[PDB]
Design an enzyme around this catalytic site. Sequence first.
Site, short mmCIF file in Angstrom:
data_model
loop_
_atom_site.label_atom_id
_atom_site.label_comp_id
_atom_site.label_asym_id
_atom_site.label_seq_id
_atom_site.Cartn_x
_atom_site.Cartn_y
_atom_site.Cartn_z
N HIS A 61 0.81 -1.21 0.00
CA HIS A 61 0.00 0.00 0.00
C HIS A 61 0.84 1.26 0.00
O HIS A 61 0.49 2.23 -0.68
CB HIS A 61 -0.94 0.01 1.22
CG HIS A 61 -1.65 -1.29 1.44
ND1 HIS A 61 -2.66 -1.74 0.62
CD2 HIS A 61 -1.49 -2.23 2.40
CE1 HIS A 61 -3.09 -2.91 1.06
NE2 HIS A 61 -2.40 -3.23 2.14
N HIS A 91 5.06 6.92 7.04
CA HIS A 91 4.79 6.56 5.66
C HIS A 91 4.30 7.79 4.92
O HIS A 91 4.18 8.88 5.49
CB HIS A 91 3.77 5.42 5.58
CG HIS A 91 2.49 5.72 6.29
ND1 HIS A 91 2.33 5.52 7.64
CD2 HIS A 91 1.31 6.20 5.83
CE1 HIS A 91 1.10 5.87 7.99
NE2 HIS A 91 0.47 6.29 6.91
N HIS A 93 1.47 9.25 1.71
CA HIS A 93 0.37 9.09 0.77
C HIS A 93 0.58 10.10 -0.35
O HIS A 93 0.56 11.31 -0.11
CB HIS A 93 -0.99 9.33 1.44
CG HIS A 93 -1.25 8.45 2.62
ND1 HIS A 93 -1.85 7.21 2.51
CD2 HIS A 93 -0.99 8.63 3.94
CE1 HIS A 93 -1.95 6.67 3.71
NE2 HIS A 93 -1.44 7.50 4.59
N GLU A 103 -3.99 13.22 1.88
CA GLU A 103 -5.20 12.65 2.45
C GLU A 103 -6.08 13.74 3.07
O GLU A 103 -7.25 13.88 2.71
CB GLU A 103 -4.85 11.56 3.46
CG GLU A 103 -4.24 10.33 2.81
CD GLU A 103 -4.46 9.07 3.62
OE1 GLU A 103 -3.97 9.00 4.76
OE2 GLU A 103 -5.13 8.15 3.11
N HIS A 116 2.93 10.99 7.30
CA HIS A 116 2.23 10.53 8.49
C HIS A 116 3.23 9.84 9.41
O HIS A 116 3.68 8.73 9.12
CB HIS A 116 1.10 9.57 8.13
CG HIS A 116 -0.11 10.24 7.57
ND1 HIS A 116 -1.10 9.56 6.89
CD2 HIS A 116 -0.51 11.54 7.60
CE1 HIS A 116 -2.04 10.40 6.52
NE2 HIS A 116 -1.71 11.61 6.94
N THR A 195 -6.54 6.00 8.29
CA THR A 195 -7.01 6.28 6.94
C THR A 195 -6.93 5.06 6.04
O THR A 195 -7.20 5.17 4.84
CB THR A 195 -6.22 7.44 6.33
OG1 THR A 195 -4.83 7.10 6.26
CG2 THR A 195 -6.39 8.70 7.16
C1 LIG Z 1 1.38 0.32 11.15
C2 LIG Z 1 0.37 1.39 11.43
O1 LIG Z 1 0.58 2.28 12.27
N1 LIG Z 1 -0.77 1.31 10.74
C3 LIG Z 1 -1.28 2.37 9.97
N2 LIG Z 1 -2.42 2.21 9.23
N3 LIG Z 1 -2.98 3.47 8.78
C4 LIG Z 1 -2.18 4.43 9.26
S1 LIG Z 1 -2.48 6.10 8.95
N4 LIG Z 1 -2.60 6.31 7.37
O2 LIG Z 1 -3.77 6.45 9.55
O3 LIG Z 1 -1.35 6.89 9.43
S2 LIG Z 1 -0.84 3.90 10.18
ZN LIG Z 2 -1.10 7.55 6.60
#
Ligand SMILES: CC(=O)Nc1nnc(S(N)(=O)=O)s1
Ligand SMILES: [Zn+2]
EC number: 4.2.1.1
Length: 257
Positions: A61, A91, A93, A103, A116, A195
């Site tokens: 993802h 990570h 987006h 996002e 994020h 998200t």
């Molecule tokens: C490994 C972990 O923390 N899982 C996540 N899944 N969605 C996330 S988010 N986009 O809301 O930051 S982080």
């Molecule tokens: Zn995120």
Amino acid sequence: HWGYGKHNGPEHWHKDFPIAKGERQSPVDIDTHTAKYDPSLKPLSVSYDQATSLRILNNGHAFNVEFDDSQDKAVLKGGPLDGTYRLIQFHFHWGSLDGQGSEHTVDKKKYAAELHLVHWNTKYGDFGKAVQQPDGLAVLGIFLKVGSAKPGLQKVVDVLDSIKTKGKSADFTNFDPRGLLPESLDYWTYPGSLTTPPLLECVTWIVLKEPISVSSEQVLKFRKLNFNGEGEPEELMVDNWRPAQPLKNRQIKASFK
Ligand SMILES: CC(=O)Nc1nnc(S(N)(=O)=O)s1
Ligand SMILES: [Zn+2]
């Protein structure tokens, strides 16, 4: 088997994760003309001086940069948070074009990407227990716009070729997430969720006001990642963002007038 395609994207998540139609879902559109200024908000505390990056992983993802969260090495205090939140991973987006990818949106404006940094409340023991608590997570949202090259990101951009397909992982030690922060720590805050599935409503969202700038050559190598695994037909990892969700009975508070 969820993703961002036409047949498993954010419009189909509610069939396997019915909380997608919940109350405090993320992301949302930050309307700067209805976001109340909260003078009782404390300054944010980003103590990343002992952050220990371990691995960078393509999870089908996005790509996650994991951190050693066995101790209070990289934490996030202050702001709206009561207690300590350990940085576990961050990570991005992004999108296929510079007009989309973020996002959260500021007055419907879409940024090219969104950073994020995920933290979990330490009073719940571990991450798996904190995700089931309303104040279990604190994600720091940082917008990315296309412009000058971000030096604190090039170490991340240079390593993407070693995690091209889903499941690939690479060593990524001694990375300093302080370089990914903007100059100002003014922020909006609102109670939200993940998200991505399982979309648990456990996140106190902190979206910073000041975006960071990244060169188009940098964000272009985000778009050369693959959703698929190795040996499978190539599907570019682009537009891995969830569209904004109804704010409902939630108020976004800002740390700045
Ligand atoms: C490994 C972990 O923390 N899982 C996540 N899944 N969605 C996330 S988010 N986009 O809301 O930051 S982080
Ligand atoms: Zn995120």
